[PDB]
């Protein structure tokens, strides 16, 4: 109240926004503002000097080049991307059919947080996260537990891709992405998916090629190795096929649990589609006995695609109808799509 109308004459009304350079034990704090100017700032006001750290946005009063205090930093375009949450809109009611795999790793993702008593008595602890892999959705298979881990603590999704992310590399600002999201809550889940390193068409712009893509992955190790990080930041990696991680990289993590999901069977595919359609069906009436019996075989990926076009082609009638000559003809397109590459083999 009175401090607002008091220090205002001591700092302002006009002032400037500078940056911090270094601090001396004599209470003189060297600051640097645009452009190329230093100074000795001795102020006892409002500091908080320990929480600052250099590189800050700390203000500089006009008279004369003194820092009264701080406001905040946003900062940079980099933070505006994700905007939390992600909230559990991918539901355990969208997945089903997998049992032996769903039981084991459910413990690892839930091993921190709850049941701390026997976790702290251990003292070695596995705070390495987990690791996933496999096509097409084998990595997305257990991603449903990552969104199930959005109901508590915090989740993060980072797209690995191939080219667009380049930088030095040095990975300077992606460690910032991991650090700024953990500063809000500090539990964490960090998820990486779709490593294309082996499937690259070419190198991007001036990076490398060849070994420099390897050394930024070796830096991806040295980041993750890592020295020195204690808490989580729970690390989760995923890809279609991993030849990437060196025998050295797997030792810190994930040395405990990495997952493989086999191709679904008649029990999983029926439990995949019936559960996927539990929210929304097409014209109701759907029976899964003849669906898995007609097409043999292929993953439950395209079974939604043929049902996507099922109500889509019927939408020419604006809601509901089935044409026997047209439906089997439209099914022929996807039926032949899998029937062009039917043999391998005899994959066996």
């Amino acid at each position: 109240e009175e401090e607002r109308s008091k220090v205002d004459d001591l700092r302002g009304t006009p002032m400037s926004v500078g940056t911090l350079e270094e601090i001396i034990d004599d209470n003189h704090a060297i600051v640097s503002t645009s452009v190329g100017s230093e100074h000795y700032v001795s102020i006892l006001s409002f500091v908080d000097k320990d929480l600052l750290e250099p590189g800050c946005s700390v203000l500089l009063n006009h008279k004369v080049h003194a820092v009264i205090g701080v406001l905040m930093d946003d900062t940079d375009p980099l933070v505006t991307v994700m905007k939390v949450e992600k909230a559990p809109q991918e539901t355990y009611a969208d997945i089903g059919g997998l049992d032996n795999q769903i039981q084991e790793i459910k413990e690892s993702v839930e091993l921190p947080l709850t049941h701390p008593e026997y976790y702290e008595e251990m003292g070695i602890k596995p705070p390495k996260g987990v690791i996933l892999y496999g096509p097409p959705g084998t990595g997305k298979t257990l991603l449903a537990k990552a969104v199930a881990n959005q109901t508590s603590a915090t989740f993060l999704r980072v797209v690995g891709s191939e080219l667009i992310q380049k930088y030095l590399g040095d990975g300077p600002k992606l460690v910032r992405e991991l650090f700024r999201v953990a500063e809000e809550h500090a539990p964490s889940i960090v998820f990486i998916d779709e490593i294309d390193a082996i499937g690259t068409k070419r190198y991007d712009s001036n990076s490398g090629g060849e070994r420099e893509i390897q050394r930024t992955m070796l830096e991806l190790l040295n980041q993750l190795d890592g020295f020195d990080s204690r808490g989580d930041v729970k690390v989760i990696m995923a890809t279609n096929r991993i030849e990437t991680l060196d025998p050295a990289l797997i030792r810190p993590g994930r040395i405990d649990r990495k997952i493989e999901f086999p191709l679904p069977d008649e029990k999983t595919k029926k439990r995949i589609f019936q559960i996927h359609t539990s929210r929304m069906t097409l014209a109701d009436d759907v029976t899964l006995d003849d669906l898995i019996m007609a097409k043999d075989d292929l993953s439950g990926a395209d079974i939604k695609a043929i049902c996507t076009e099922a109500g889509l082609m019927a939408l020419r009638e604006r809601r509901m109808k089935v044409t026997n000559e047209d439906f089997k003809k439209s099914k022929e397109n996807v039926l032949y799509k899998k029937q062009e590459g039917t043999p391998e083999g005899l994959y066996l």
Partner: protein
């Protein structure tokens, strides 16, 4: 009509039947069916807006619901004159129920936006003016039963239509989860009062008629119940055999069987620790040494004889914990000792509590279910002998704890005889006195008691006691939600608000973090000292996350008053479970150089947070606590408080024999803890030993 089947989409087909009504009635649905059934036709669901009126006036049911799936709006207001509405509605009421559960035995509906929303939308006009008893009673749906009731006093809602045990099991279960957010819960049979024979009889009829599987909720009910009130009223409601059911009642064999089971799950060291402390003779504390032998032995008389013969020296208040063990020893099962327990009362003018008030408290607190009924009339007659010498102050604190505990609805009024001594007029001593004095007499609940006592005491007003006087009305009505409405005053003394939020809200979910956090930030200074005191109630749900967090900043504060209320805020509600953080926090706390009892009140009271009545045999070893209390007692050197702390952790430490836990899972509240714990706030000299009874 032909307009309903037009290819054009032009509006509207709604409400058009009101204009021309009797004439379209000559036709039937035969014209409507070809438009709705055939696909690729205009006005599919739009034609149902006119059809929902035709099927409603024709009493046809399950068709009106199927046609209202898309509408969801015109169902509310539909054609006004109430006589045609309430007529066909009862025809729709009884006519929709027969369309359900026709299999029979479910399958259940199938809250759905079709069935449950339509009966809810029409229930508006039902609860507005006319008729009564909608499909919620006929269909028996528990989902609509949550929306059946309207805002009303729930005290008359305890009665329901009687049905089979099969449906009543799911009825009481789903009505419980509705009432957990409501002030009144099915557990109110303890608190309420009531006191009529209805709940006592109905409580014993849930296990009827089976006497074999009745072992639960009956045998474990009578033994874990310390009061006779639940074993008295239910005695007339328990018809099993004849007259011989008293063996498992009166807490004679009941408390004896569970005490032997505590020995099997025990036990506490007797010869080693006590006889080793006997070579140390009497410590200079004269504080915590008496209550030690109280709970321990139990029952042995040789240890009881050393108590009596010693305390005849009369020195200070030391007799408190000792004579409290005189009765509690034999009373561990029953009855007991109630004859010679009150003998030292009139045998020792008091003239204060520390002399003759000790044994006068003995018979009152150690009673535990008596009454019986001689103890009631004995306590009231005994206190009427000593009036001017008590007088209004020091022993008037403990006396209400011998009545309101056992019976909240007792007919004998001990308030009027004590209230005539208020002429002492002292505002200071009356603070910690009249606080629990008027409150612990009885639970009341008739709202007439608080109005009476307000007029006779004030008269005028005391300008001070009126603070604690209105808090009794806040204590009287339990979580009735009137308390948030009673805090609008918010006087400068601020004692109203802190006692209002704690007791005035009892629920499973906290929900009070919005108000509790607001009163501390918006409150005046020095109020934050008493803010953590509300943590002894609302924190019973999840004390781990919320308690130690905020108290971590309040524990390291240099103010001795707020640090004294910090460890107390955690206190008993925080001592239910152990953790590695609590044990690791004990370091550096006892290493402080601060003087005064606040130093050892912070560290040593936290030593009792590792367990309550658990060990040591079985389970946690006592050598860990022995080495901890020995190394800390080498400082100062005396500083006699070092002999208070080493015997403090073994108060509840070596007692055992009672698992609390919570107390209790039945959700009562201990009236001795909330009473005494408010005195240590302006602690002076002897107000700390009054709390030592626990």
């Amino acid at each position: 009509m032909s307009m309903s089947g037009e290819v054009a989409k032009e509006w509207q087909e709604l409400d058009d039947a009101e204009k021309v009504q009797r004439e379209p009635l000559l036709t039937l649905v035969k014209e409507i069916v070809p438009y709705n059934m055939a696909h690729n036709a205009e006005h599919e669901a739009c034609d149902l807006l006119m059809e929902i009126e035709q099927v409603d006036m024709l009493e046809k049911d399950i068709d009106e619901n199927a046609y209202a799936k898309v509408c969801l709006y015109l169902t509310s207001c539909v054609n006004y004159v109430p006589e045609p509405e309430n007529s066909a509605l009862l025809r729709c009421a009884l006519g929709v129920f027969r369309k359900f559960s026709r299999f029979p035995e479910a399958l259940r509906l199938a809250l759905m936006l079709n069935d449950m929303e339509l009966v809810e939308d029409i229930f508006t006009s039902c609860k507005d003016v006319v008729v009564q008893k909608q499909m919620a009673f006929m269909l028996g749906r528990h989902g609509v039963f949550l929306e059946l009731s309207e805002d009303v006093e729930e005290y008359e809602d305890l009665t329901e239509i009687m049905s089979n045990v099969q449906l009543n099991s799911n009825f009481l279960a789903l009505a419980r989860e509705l009432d957990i957010m409501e002030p009144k819960v099915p557990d109110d049979i303890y608190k309420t009062h009531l006191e009529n024979n209805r709940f006592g009889g109905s409580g014993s009829q849930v296990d009827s008629a089976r006497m074999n599987l009745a072992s639960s909720f009956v045998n474990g009910f009578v033994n874990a119940a310390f009061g006779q009130d639940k074993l008295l009223t239910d005695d007339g409601n328990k018809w099993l055999y004849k007259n011989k059911d008293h063996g498992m009642l009166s807490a004679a064999a009941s408390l004896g069987m569970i005490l032997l089971w505590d020995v099997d799950g025990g036990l506490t060291q007797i010869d080693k620790y006590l006889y080793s402390s006997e070579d140390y003779i009497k410590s200079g504390a004269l504080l915590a040494c008496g209550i030690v032998n109280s709970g321990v032995r139990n029952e042995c008389d040789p240890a009881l004889a050393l108590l009596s013969d010693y305390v005849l020296h009369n020195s200070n208040t030391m007799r408190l914990g000792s004579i409290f063990g005189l009765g509690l020893a034999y009373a561990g099962s029953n009855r007991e000792d109630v004859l010679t327990l009150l003998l030292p009362v009139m045998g020792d003018s008091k003239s204060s509590m520390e002399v003759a008030g000790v044994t006068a408290l003995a018979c009152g607190m150690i009673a535990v279910g008596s009454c019986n009924g001689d103890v009631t009339s004995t306590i009231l007659q005994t206190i009427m002998e000593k009036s001017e010498t008590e007088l209004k102050d020091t022993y008037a604190r403990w006396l209400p704890l011998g009545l309101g505990l056992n019976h909240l609805g007792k007919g004998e009024a001990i308030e009027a005889i004590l209230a005539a001594l208020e002429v002492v007029s002292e505002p200071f001593r009356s603070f910690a006195n009249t606080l629990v004095d008027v409150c612990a007499y009885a639970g009341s609940g008739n709202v007439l008691k608080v109005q009476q006592l307000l007029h006779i005491c004030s008269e005028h007003f005391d300008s001070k006691e009126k603070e604690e006087d209105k808090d009794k009305k806040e204590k009287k009505d339990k979580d009735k939600k009137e308390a948030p409405a009673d805090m609008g005053a918010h006087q400068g003394v601020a004692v109203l608000g802190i006692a209002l939020i704690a007791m005035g809200e009892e629920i499973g979910a906290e929900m009070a973090l919005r108000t509790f956090g607001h009163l501390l930030r918006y409150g005046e200074p020095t109020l934050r000292r008493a803010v953590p005191l509300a943590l002894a109630l609302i924190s019973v749900s999840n004390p781990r996350l919320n308690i130690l967090d905020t108290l971590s900043k309040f524990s390291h504060d240099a103010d001795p008053e707020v640090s004294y209320n910090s460890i107390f805020a955690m206190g008993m509600v925080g001592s239910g479970t152990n953790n590695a953080r609590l044990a690791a926090m004990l370091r550096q706390l006892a290493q402080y150089h601060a003087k005064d009892p606040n130093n050892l009140f912070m560290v040593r009271l936290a030593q009792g947070l590792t367990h309550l009545g658990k060990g040591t045999l079985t389970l946690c070893p006592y050598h860990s606590d022995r080495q901890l209390m020995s190394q800390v007692a080498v400082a100062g050197l005396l500083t006699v408080l070092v002999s208070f702390l080493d015997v403090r952790n073994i108060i509840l430490g070596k007692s055992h024999y009672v698992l609390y836990g919570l107390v209790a899972a039945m959700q009562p509240r201990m009236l001795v803890t909330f009473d005494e714990e408010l005195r240590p706030l302006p602690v002076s000299v002897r107000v700390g030993q009054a709390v030592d009874v626990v």
